[PDB]
Design a binder for this molecule. Structure first.
Ligand SMILES: CC(=O)O[C@H]1C(=O)[C@@]2(C)[C@H]([C@H](OC(=O)c3ccccc3)[C@]3(O)C[C@H](OC(=O)[C@H](O)[C@@H](NC(=O)c4ccccc4)c4ccccc4)C(C)=C1C3(C)C)[C@]1(OC(C)=O)CO[C@@H]1C[C@@H]2O
Ligand SMILES: Nc1nc2c(ncn2[C@@H]2O[C@H](COP(=O)(O)OP(=O)(O)OP(=O)(O)O)[C@@H](O)[C@H]2O)c(=O)[nH]1
Ligand SMILES: Nc1nc2c(ncn2[C@@H]2O[C@H](COP(=O)(O)OP(=O)(O)O)[C@@H](O)[C@H]2O)c(=O)[nH]1
Ligand SMILES: [Mg+2]
Lengths: 440, 338, 429
């Protein structure tokens, strides 16, 4: 089997998980209360849901999820919502104050009093697992919980499992837009966990998806529901090969093998091509070449950085629906013909292709349009360093005067650790600059 | 210009047992005796994987006599001249802070030599001046002052009042007038007995409060006639509790907040020192952020010599602590140069 | 979980607290008798933040009423919501402070502080997880300032690591009705600067200006001022009680808004304030909510933010709204008025959003500024202080109760240190 364990930490992670499990239940025809009427109606016995769901004797399907937060508002929302009857009652909360947006509180002071429960539940889930593939961790750099507790949890997981894959889906802070004052500190502090423990971290920011919603979907006032639905679509596209048959499947292990060129360079961008409203669903062919070209536009990138200011070092294109390999080869040849898309000389192969026969699913009441073809592009490129640099500058502007540092050092953090994380980020930026130079 | 805050950082010598049990790995490869904290110059230390610049670097062979003669002898001259003087001590656990500041009877520490030379100096100056010495010893704990030499005093008695003539004069503080260094050390031991402490990790006697020793020297004319000119001075010897991370802590509770306060106090002190060294920030210095900085409001300016004895170790068991200590030392004078 | 203890001291504090409990009870659908008559399950979900259960379905607010004369207690007990409170929580002496800080702090209040602390301990021990305390008083008065600051000191000694909030009503330069306001205000600020984590400065002059001009009220009374302060108080702690999209408890606001341990004096505000006649001639949208929010004349602190720079800002919206609009508007405000924001903080705005707007309003917002301009307020008080201290105008009344001149000098020096610290960051750098 091909199981994957999903973990959601903090408000952003939990709400993204709400969207993700909504999409998954819609995909596999599982009702909110856990029963699947298709098996009773037809008979079933040949479906594929072990990647995310686990059966019981009564026919209920329980997801392989762990919802974690340091305050109970969001998880109490889930406990009394539409999907209250779906999850196991082990949706773990701290019956106390949250991290309150600082790494030190989430990592050292109050995050150590729930980590035992989280690890015990992860162990129990893994014991039911026979073919475990990896961990999909959802969190946010900006928040205290999503940074500190995620760091602690990933450290413990690396100590315990070690050999298993770990994939991150994080909400990086945007260049201009921001909803907190101490975001740079937490984001820089998460550098160590992102580097040493994570195997491949996919980064997102709210500003880029807001721009995508404004331009493509024709949504003038977008809320977090739309962002979560888009991120859920991307995550479903990533894991589609573990659930359905396709011409060229792509599991997580080979995925990382052909995406990650060096151990420290595991920070790819992600994008989804056919983001189009139902009004614009007509007047467009949406052929394979069209969507593949749409993947590489700077505007459609889900991280506010310019790909044209850096050399592509690897690319993986995961197609869903009615797609023929010859069309994909023609599209990739067309992309290689273009001059603006610069590839590093030491990666002549360039692209990886996977194809799946399951078309994308549409959530009812969602604002995405039904399409026959879709493609998700994950690209390892040097552009992301620019994003790090801008956040780097923000950190300096707040650390010269030691602003807000007393809150952090009052919760078990040492003053010297800030500079250490800063130097680690600087080393990472230097490595990303170094790999981009042409060989001699 | 010349400034008044000087940084002298010393490297602890290896013990016989640690050297024997840790040099085996170095001998085999060429155990953690890598000599991580080495020296290349009296004012520069690039052997930490990074380059740091310090006012004075005190090597392995440096014994107590040259330590005193280099770090704190001019402070006695300044305090006898009529200007305040201060010496801080900072070092994590196992860094030899106690060995340097106090020492053993075989090897006298900094306090012994400083008191001995002060007593000799006043003995020489007796022929022309009448000089007396007043001693006080107090502890700062959770932003509360406690009299170590006179316990049972309520915390609300000991408060700071800003005297009009640039004096602090913490109220209800017991005062002593020892006449010799021996009884000074007896009083110091009496105070250290009352020092707040608690077992932590495998250590049983980890100090968890800042300690301050104040020596007020009052001088007046003997062989002359004058109306009112004494200009009494103060020498401060400050022992700062080492920083600590909750991660090491497990019991939490009162040990947490205590430790947290210590960190906050250290941070405040650092800012004050930095605010004093940078000429741009001279408009305002955050003295009020902690009890210690308020207590030393007039004992860090340009008209008073301040020094800091930073004690580190070369072992690998304390690599992170030593790096943190070096970074804290660099905070005083962030002369980022190569 | 995350339950708050409310304390009231003095006439002004007791009146504001009575209005605050009326507003909160209306928000949660609580009858004056203490029973529940709501129309939504969400109200009951997190009612334990402010209330305690009682056997016959009743709900008792977790309030503690303190005074030194029984007149205000009798007035509150006979009010519309008098029966809601616990009779045991009423604590009061017999000899008033008489607008004397020394009597409130040293002579009279020292007797009643033990009973008040015992009641506070009884209330706090039964709590599940204590978020923190919330005092309401005025610094210009007698028993209010003195006994308030005494209680803050005692509770900080007993509960060092819990968030402390004080909704202080500062004295005004124009609207002054007590001759010895500078002494009381200085002596109370000397304690508040040390023993608090937040301090929402409120001034009667600003509230009167808002009532006259923004609301077009012809004859304001203290009820309307208490109404505005109650709206602010309810808005600040909304994220604890109701679900939202960006939750923000008291500690999160404290962490985001306070850069240094002493700069924790804030200017509050409530955005949708309009007259009844002019309601139909305007929409209700996020951009105009923001425009009224950052309007210099809508602040309750009687300080012009244009004469300073915003060290930090916090905006707590309530209602169904898009996050893109909120973020875009806050970014536009920061970029358009870059002269009024400090350069050395990349983002000066902490945003929170709650999904439940207050009763008959489509959506509302609350503002918590932290700007250098507040120093001017202290400067004003400091001026009056020295104007009365060089000659010792009324000093004998204070020294008769056991005070000393050194305490006055210490308080003045501390206030000057605070003003200088605030002025340090106002200069361009
Ligand atoms: C039909 C209609 O629109 O009625 C409104 C109303 O006319 C206006 C003018 C209301 C009205 O407010 C005032 O005129 C007012 C007067 C003095 C002091 C403060 C307010 C209203 O009184 C206020 C009242 O507001 C509420 O109900 C809120 O929930 C408020 N609670 C209370 O006012 C309240 C007080 C005591 C007992 C029970 C409820 C609240 C505000 C913030 C946080 C929590 C609760 C409402 C609906 C109205 C009237 C009645 C006319 C406004 O309400 C507020 C609180 O800002 C003033 O500007 C808004 C805009 C509204 O349009
Ligand atoms: N994409 C997306 N991002 C979100 C969502 N909710 C919150 N965020 C992001 O979360 C970031 C801040 O994290 P927090 O709101 O503090 O949530 P948290 O990580 O749990 O941190 P704490 O609440 O303090 O525990 C913001 O910058 C938001 O951009 C969401 O629903 N979708
Ligand atoms: N907002 C408001 N302020 C008040 C009220 N009553 C008094 N004040 C203010 O409080 C100050 C007097 O303080 P006071 O209540 O007498 O203090 P106390 O005697 O110690 O309780 C005056 O400057 C008034 O502006 C009230 O009902 N509402
Ligand atoms: Mg949260």
């Amino acid at each position: 089997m091909r199981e994957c364990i999903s973990i959601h930490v903090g408000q952003a992670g939990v709400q993204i998980g709400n969207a993700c499990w909504e999409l998954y239940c819609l995909e596999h025809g599982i009702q909110p209360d856990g029963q699947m009427p298709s098996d009773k109606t037809i008979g079933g016995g040949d479906d594929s849901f072990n990647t995310f769901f686990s059966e019981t004797g009564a026919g209920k399907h329980v997801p392989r999820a762990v919802f974690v937060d340091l305050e109970p508002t969001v998880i109490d929302e889930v406990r009394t919502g539409t999907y209250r009857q779906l999850f196991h009652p082990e949706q773990l909360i701290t019956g106390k104050e949250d991290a309150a947006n600082n790494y030190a509180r989430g990592h050292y002071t109050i995050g150590k009093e729930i980590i035992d429960l989280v690890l015990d539940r992860i162990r129990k889930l893994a014991d039911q697992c026979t073919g475990l593939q990896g961990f999909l961790v959802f969190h946010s750099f900006g928040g205290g919980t999503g940074s500190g507790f995620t760091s602690l949890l990933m450290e413990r997981l690396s100590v315990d499992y070690g050999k298993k894959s770990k994939l991150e889906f994080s909400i990086y802070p945007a260049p201009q837009v921001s909803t907190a004052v101490v975001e740079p500190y937490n984001s820089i502090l998460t550098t160590h966990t992102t580097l040493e423990h994570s195997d491949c971290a996919f980064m997102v920011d709210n500003e880029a998806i807001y721009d995508i919603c404004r331009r493509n979907l024709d949504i003038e006032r977008p809320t977090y529901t739309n962002l979560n639905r888009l991120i859920s679509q991307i995550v479903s596209s990533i894991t589609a090969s573990l659930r359905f048959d396709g011409a060229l499947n792509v599991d997580l292990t080979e995925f990382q093998t052909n995406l990650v060129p060096y151990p420290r360079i595991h920070f790819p961008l992600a994008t989804y091509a056919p983001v189009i409203s139902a009004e614009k669903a007509y007047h467009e062919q949406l052929s394979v070449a069209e969507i593949t070209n749409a993947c590489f536009e700077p505007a459609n990138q889900m991280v506010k950085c310019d790909p044209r200011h850096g050399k592509y070092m690897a690319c993986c294109l995961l197609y869903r629906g009615d797609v023929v390999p010859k069309d994909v080869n023609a599209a990739i040849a067309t992309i290689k013909t273009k001059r603006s898309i610069q590839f590093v000389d030491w990666c002549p192969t360039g692209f990886k292709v996977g194809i799946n026969y399951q078309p994308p699913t549409v959530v009812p009441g969602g604002d995405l349009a039904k399409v026959q073809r879709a493609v998700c592009m994950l690209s390892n490129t040097t552009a992301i360093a620019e994003a790090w640099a801008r956040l780097d500058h923000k950190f300096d502007l707040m650390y010269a005067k030691r602003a807000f540092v007393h809150w952090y050092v009052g919760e078990g953090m040492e003053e010297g650790e800030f500079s250490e994380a800063r130097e680690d980020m600087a080393a990472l930026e230097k490595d990303y600059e170094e790999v981009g130079v042409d060989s001699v | 210009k010349q400034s008044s805050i000087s940084v002298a950082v010393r490297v602890r010598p290896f013990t016989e047992a640690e050297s024997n049990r840790l040099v085996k790995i170095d001998n085999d490869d060429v155990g953690g005796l890598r000599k991580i904290i080495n020296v290349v110059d009296d004012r520069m230390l690039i052997i930490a994987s990074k380059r740091f610049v310090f006012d004075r670097l005190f090597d392995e062979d440096c014994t107590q006599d040259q330590v005193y003669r280099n770090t704190t002898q001019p402070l006695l001259d300044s305090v006898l001249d009529g200007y305040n003087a201060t010496v801080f001590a900072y070092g994590a656990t196992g860094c030899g802070k106690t060995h340097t500041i106090s020492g053993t009877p075989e090897d006298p520490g900094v306090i012994f030599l400083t008191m001995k030379e002060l007593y000799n100096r006043i003995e020489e100056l007796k022929d022309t001046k009448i000089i007396d010495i007043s001693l006080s010893y107090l502890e700062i704990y959770n932003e509360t002052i406690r009299d170590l030499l006179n316990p049972m005093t309520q915390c609300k008695n000991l408060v700071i009042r800003e005297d009009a003539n640039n004096k602090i004069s913490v109220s209800n503080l017991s005062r002593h007038r020892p006449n010799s260094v021996e009884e000074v050390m007896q009083l110091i031991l009496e105070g250290n007995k009352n020092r707040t402490c608690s077992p932590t990790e495998a250590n049983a006697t980890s100090s968890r409060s800042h300690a301050v020793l104040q020596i007020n020297v009052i001088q007046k004319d003997r062989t002359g006639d004058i109306t009112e000119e004494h200009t009494f001075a103060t020498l401060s010897i400050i022992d700062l509790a080492g920083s600590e991370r909750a991660a090491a802590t497990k019991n939490r509770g009162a040990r947490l907040n205590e430790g947290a306060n210590i960190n906050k106090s250290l941070l405040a002190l650092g800012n004050c020192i930095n605010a004093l060294c940078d000429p741009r920030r001279r408009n305002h210095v955050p003295y009020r952020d902690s009890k210690l900085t308020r207590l030393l409001k007039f004992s860090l300016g340009g008209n008073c010599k301040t020094v800091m004895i930073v004690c580190v170790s070369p072992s690998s068991q304390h690599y992170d602590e030593t790096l943190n200590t070096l970074k804290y030392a660099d905070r005083a004078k962030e002369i980022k140069t190569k | 979980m995350r339950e708050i203890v409310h304390i009231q001291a003095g006439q002004c504090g007791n009146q504001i607290g009575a209005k605050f409990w009326e507003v909160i009870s209306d928000e949660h659908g609580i009858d004056p008798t203490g029973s529940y008559h709501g129309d939504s399950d969400l109200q009951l979900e997190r009612i334990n933040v402010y209330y305690n259960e009682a056997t016959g379905n009743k709900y008792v607010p977790r309030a503690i009423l303190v005074d030194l004369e029984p007149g205000t207690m009798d007035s509150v007990r006979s009010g519309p919501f008098g029966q809601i409170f616990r009779p045991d929580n009423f604590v009061f002496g017999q000899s008033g402070a008489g607008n004397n800080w020394a009597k409130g702090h040293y002579t009279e209040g020292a007797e009643l502080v033990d009973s008040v602390l015992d009641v506070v301990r009884k209330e706090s021990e039964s709590c599940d997880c204590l978020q923190g305390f919330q005092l309401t008083h005025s610094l210009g008065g007698g028993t209010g300032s003195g006994m308030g600051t005494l209680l803050i000191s005692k509770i900080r000694e007993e509960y060092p690591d819990r968030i402390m909030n004080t909704f202080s009503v500062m004295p005004s330069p124009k609207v002054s009705d007590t001759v010895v306001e500078p002494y009381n205000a200085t002596l109370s600020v000397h304690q508040l600067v040390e023993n608090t984590d937040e301090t929402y400065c409120i001034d009667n002059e600003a509230l009167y200006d808002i009532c006259f001009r923004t609301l077009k009220l012809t004859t304001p009374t203290y009820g309307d001022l208490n109404h505005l302060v109650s709206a602010t108080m309810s808005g600040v702690t909304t994220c604890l009680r109701f679900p939202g999209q960006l939750n923000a408890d008291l500690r999160k606001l404290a962490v985001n808004m306070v850069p240094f341990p002493r700069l924790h004096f804030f200017m509050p505000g409530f955005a949708p304030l309009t007259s009844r006649g002019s309601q139909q001639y305007r929409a209700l949208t996020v951009p105009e909510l923001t425009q009224q929010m950052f309007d210099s004349k809508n602040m309750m602190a009687a300080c012009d933010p244009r004469h300073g720079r915003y060290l930090t800002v916090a905006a707590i919206f309530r209602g169904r709204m898009s996050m893109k609009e909120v973020d875009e508007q806050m970014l536009n405000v920061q970029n358009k008025n870059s002269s009024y924001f400090v350069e050395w903080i990349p983002n000066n705005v902490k945003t929170a959003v709650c999904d439940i707007p207050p009763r008959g309003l489509k959506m509302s917002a609350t503002f918590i500024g932290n700007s250098t301009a507040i120093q001017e307020l202290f400067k004003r008080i400091s001026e009056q202080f020295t104007a009365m201290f060089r000659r010792k105008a009324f000093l004998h009344w204070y020294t008769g109760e056991g005070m000393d001149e050194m305490e006055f000098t210490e308080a003045e020096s501390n206030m000057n240190d605070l003003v200088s610290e605030y002025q340090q960051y106002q200069d361009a750098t």
